[PDB]
Amino acid sequence: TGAWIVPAIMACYLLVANILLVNLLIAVFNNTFFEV
Amino acid sequence: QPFRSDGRVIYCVNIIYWYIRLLDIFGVNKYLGPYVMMIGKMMIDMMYFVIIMLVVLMSFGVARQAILFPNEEPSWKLAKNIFYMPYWMIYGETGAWIVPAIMACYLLVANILLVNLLIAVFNNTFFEV
Amino acid sequence: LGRKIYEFYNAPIVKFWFYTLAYIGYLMLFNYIVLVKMERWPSTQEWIVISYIFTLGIEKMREILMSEPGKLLQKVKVWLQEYWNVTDLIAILLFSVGMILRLQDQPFRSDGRVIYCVNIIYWYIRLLDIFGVNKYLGPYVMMIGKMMIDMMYFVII
Numbered sequence: 656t657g658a659w660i661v662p663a664i665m666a667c668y669l670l671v672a673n674i675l676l677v678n679l680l681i682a683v684f685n686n687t688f689f690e691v
Numbered sequence: 692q693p694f695r696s697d698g699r700v701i702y703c704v705n706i707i708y709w710y711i712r713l714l715d716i717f718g719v720n721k722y723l724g725p726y727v728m729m730i731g732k733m734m735i736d737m738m739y740f741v742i743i744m745l746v747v748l749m750s751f752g753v754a755r756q757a758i759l760f761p762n763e764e765p766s767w768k769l770a771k772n773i774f775y776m777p778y779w780m781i782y783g784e785t786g787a788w789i790v791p792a793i794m795a796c797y798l799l800v801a802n803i804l805l806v807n808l809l810i811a812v813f814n815n816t817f818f819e820v
Numbered sequence: 821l822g823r824k825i826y827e828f829y830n831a832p833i834v835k836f837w838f839y840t841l842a843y844i845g846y847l848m849l850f851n852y853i854v855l856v857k858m859e860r861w862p863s864t865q866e867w868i869v870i871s872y873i874f875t876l877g878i879e880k881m882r883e884i885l886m887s888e889p890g891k892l893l894q895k896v897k898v899w900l901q902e903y904w905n906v907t908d909l910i911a912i913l914l915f916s917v918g919m920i921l922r923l924q925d926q927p928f929r930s931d932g933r934v935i936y937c938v939n940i941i942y943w944y945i946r947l948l949d950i951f952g953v954n955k956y957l958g959p960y961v962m963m964i965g966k967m968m969i970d971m972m973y974f975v976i977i
């Protein structure tokens with residue numbers, strides 16, 4: 656009936672877990688290259 | 692036989708070079724030539740990266756092989772384990788907490804440091820050529 | 821000929837290459853004593869690693885004694901201002917604790933083996949300080965140094 660709160664959790668997990676934070680990390684480690 | 696299998700293996704390792712040899716021709720293409728020279732610079736860059744990658748990675752691998760499987764007899768299969776098992780350790784898993792610190796540092800320094808260092812290195816080498 | 825030998829072996833580059841060949845041998849013997857069996861009494865390959873750690877401890881004591889300031893606490897603080905000296909001392913007391921636990925019977929031998937297995941990690945990481953001098957590896961070592969602080973601030977988020 657209302658078993659749809661869980662796929663929203665997996666959907667936000669896929670949205671913010673790798674696809675945000677990992678690309679933030681290559682961006683951070685790319686900016687620190689030329690400064691040193 | 693069994694020298695026919697050795698000749699087949701030598702043919703099978705020669706076809707690799709006879710495919711790699713096409714990069715010298717590709718070196719003349721206005722769009723492939725920069726990529727061939729980029730492979731040429733990235734070979735030296737990855738060669739210098741490989742020492743730090745080994746120092747980071749096979750030390751843990753030795754740590755995993757000395758924490759787990761504590762009864763491995765002296766044989767040459769130990770070296771094959773310590774540079775084959777951590778190569779495929781993606782799917783692998785009172786005071787029994789020293790091991791999760793090892794996995795935690797492994798996840799911290801193995802991919803999430805060295806791989807991003809590698810896209811950073813290969814991104815800096817783009818505009819210079 | 822003796823003057824030539826003494827002039828060769830007192831050179832700093834010769835000392836550096838001799839010292840890193842002795843490390844490479846130390847890493848080899850430490851890998852051997854963490855992969856092969858370990859009994860009530862240590863083998864030759866483990867007594868060599870024990871003697872390695874004890875002679876470095878004596879060398880670090882000579883670094884404590886033979887330095888520039890005259891006060892003992894002042895020269896101790898000056899030597900401990902460098903982070904690598906701190907982690908080297910931490911590894912020396914860690915190895916002596918692991919050896920003392922290993923010299924006892926079971927289950928303390930497993931604890932000594934675990935302490936050896938966590939000390940080999942630092943004794944591989946210590947090579948980054950040497951790599952810091954390579955014209956091509958030194959930038960990468962400093963990049964690891966900045967990326968440690970960057971990943972530490974990233975880890976909270």
Ligand SMILES: CC(C)CCC[C@@H](C)[C@H]1CC[C@H]2[C@@H]3CC=C4C[C@@H](OC(=O)CCC(=O)O)CC[C@]4(C)[C@H]3CC[C@]12C
Nearest residue numbers: 745749765766767768769770773847848851852855856
């Ligand atoms: C840090 C990087 C650059 C190199 C790491 C090298 C190690 C992975 C090697 C170097 C010394 C090797 C050991 C040297 C000697 C032996 C004995 C060998 O057994 C025999 O030769 C049987 C006969 C006998 O000696 O009794 C089995 C492999 C083993 C443990 C080797 C396992 C792999 C080791 C630890």
Ligand SMILES: CC(C)CCC[C@@H](C)[C@H]1CC[C@H]2[C@@H]3CC=C4C[C@@H](OC(=O)CCC(=O)O)CC[C@]4(C)[C@H]3CC[C@]12C
Nearest residue numbers: 838839840841842843844845846848849863864865868
């Ligand atoms: C900077 C330098 C000191 C690095 C080079 C290290 C070598 C000088 C060491 C490392 C491994 C050592 C060996 C490790 C084990 C043995 C076996 C040991 O013999 C036994 O234990 C029983 C007899 C046997 O079966 O050999 C005799 C010494 C020997 C050859 C050692 C001789 C000295 C070696 C070659």
Ligand SMILES: CC(C)CCC[C@@H](C)[C@H]1CC[C@H]2[C@@H]3CC=C4C[C@@H](OC(=O)CCC(=O)O)CC[C@]4(C)[C@H]3CC[C@]12C
Nearest residue numbers: 765840841842843844845846847848849852863864865
């Ligand atoms: C000059 C720099 C690059 C250092 C070179 C170090 C090597 C000369 C050492 C380091 C590890 C040593 C090995 C470590 C352990 C063993 C096992 C040892 O065999 C045993 O302990 C089993 C019993 C037996 O002796 O038969 C024989 C010597 C050997 C191969 C050693 C031979 C000498 C090695 C290769």
Ligand SMILES: Cc1cc(NC(=O)[C@H](c2ccccc2)N2CCCc3ccccc32)no1
Nearest residue numbers: 839840842843846872873876879946947950
């Ligand atoms: C045990 C053990 C450790 C070790 N090596 C060092 O920890 C280090 C070193 C590391 C790599 C290459 C060369 C030397 N080293 C040895 C002597 C004391 C000392 C002083 C200042 C800086 C380095 C250094 N050898 O056996």
